[PDB]
Amino acid sequence: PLAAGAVILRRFAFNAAEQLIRDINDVASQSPFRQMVTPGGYTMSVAMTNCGHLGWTTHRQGYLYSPIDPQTNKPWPAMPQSFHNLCQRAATAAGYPDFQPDACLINRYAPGAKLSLHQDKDEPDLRAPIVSVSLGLPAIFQFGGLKRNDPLKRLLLEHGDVVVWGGESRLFYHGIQPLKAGFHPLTIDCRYNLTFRQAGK
Length: 201
Ligand SMILES: O=C(O)c1ccc(O)c2ncccc12
Ligand SMILES: [Mn+2]
What we know:
By secondary structure, the protein is of the alpha+beta class. The protein contains 2 helices and 12 strands. A hairpin with a 2-residue loop joins strand 3 (55-59) and strand 4 (62-66). It binds 8-hydroxyquinoline-5-carboxylic acid and manganese (II) ion (MN). Manganese (II) ion binds next to loops. It is classed as oxidoreductase/oxidoreductase inhibitor.
């Protein structure tokens, strides 16, 4: 059992990937990818956008979920059908049939992009899982435990892999190591990851 509460579904989204990527591009045509600035003043190497009713974003030197994209002053694009359906199939298979995300954060990793170790604790109910979908180039996902200094474990996440982070794992510190450059036939030179969240109360 790699991470208590987590359910790894390798290649679960492999068949859906081309459609998912088309929908990423459609979302980004409305709410573009942008590299947000952390509360500490650093520009993230990962570029982000969102779809759904709520979107994860910097605002006033903190993080929060907002119904409005600060870059466009318009709502985030609606949740694509492909996104909704894939998430529900994965969550249901993993034992979370009532998971109803209202936010999907879309991350784009260019070579060298990384995410420092952190917890996702900005959501109102931490009993709801987060569903992660990997597309394109492979990345090393690192995760520890409930404490910042718990022992780290690592696993490669490859194109089409889905992880449902539930139970205890929902609160683990985690991150992504600097992305290795390469080629993928559907994303060309990057990785994307979708993370579905229940962000509304
Ligand atoms: O699955 C991933 O690649 C991933 C990457 C970066 C994150 O901040 C995440 N947060 C929660 C769940 C998954 C992820
Ligand atoms: Mn995270």
